[PDB]
Design a protein around this nucleic acid. Sequence first.
RNA 1: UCCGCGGCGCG
DNA 2: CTCTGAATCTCTTCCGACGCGCCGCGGGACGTAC
DNA 3: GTACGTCCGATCTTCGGAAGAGATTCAGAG
Lengths: 50, 50, 123
Amino acid sequence: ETLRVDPTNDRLSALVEIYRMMRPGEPPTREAAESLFENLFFSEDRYDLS
Amino acid sequence: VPLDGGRFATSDLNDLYRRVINRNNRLKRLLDLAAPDIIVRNEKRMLQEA
Amino acid sequence: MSEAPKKRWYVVQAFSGFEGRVATSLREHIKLHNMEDLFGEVMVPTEEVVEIRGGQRRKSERKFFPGYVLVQMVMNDASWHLVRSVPRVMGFIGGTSDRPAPISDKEVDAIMNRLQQVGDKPR
RNA sequence: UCCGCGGCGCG
DNA sequence: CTCTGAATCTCTTCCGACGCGCCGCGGGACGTAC
DNA sequence: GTACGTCCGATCTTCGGAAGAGATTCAGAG
């Protein structure tokens, strides 16, 4: 049911949703969404577990 | 109130009032020059926020 | 471009005292990103009233309106992201957030014929 | 010079 | 099917002792002349 | 190295507790 409630069906939809949610009020772009997502949890500079 | 030394210990009211009157002065100096409507609307909003 | 519209001046705000720095940064970004067709020229209004005495001498540079620069860009997403990417520049000044608001053609004519008389009483 | 902020301590 | 409609879920605000004593820092930045 | 004018971009994490206003909802009836 968790997946059933979710209206997204593609990776592009999820990227657009996360880009719009993280920073509201801006035109979403697939490259921009990918860059934002990759810089939040998979970049050594801004994220680093001890 | 002046403090020990060559400086002055200002209160927040002075800064707020200075900001408001400077915003009003810019409002006055933009209206007579037939400034673009978008900019005058934005600075009116910013004066309202101030 | 894909059409033939008027890439009229659009309002972008900056930090005071950095207007020339922001303009140079935009120009060098355009140069290095190799995207020059989508952009035209960056123009910031200024006026020159000369006084021979009274403290500041032989020159006095001011602005028609401070903290705002004009861009000849066009409506799309790549240019929007490019302008957002430059430092010391916040969001656009228009209507809705995602799509800015242009300037009226007649009032653009007014601003440009105000700009053409800046070269009054020269030499 | 008389105010603000932060910290420690006593009832 | 569709219109009320009363109940429920969710979001926003204000509140949380009372007198001291002592000490330290406080418009800071930032370019622009000079 | 020292007056002086203008200004105002690094995007916040760890509390209940109640009170109230607004959006939602499903319950039921015509």
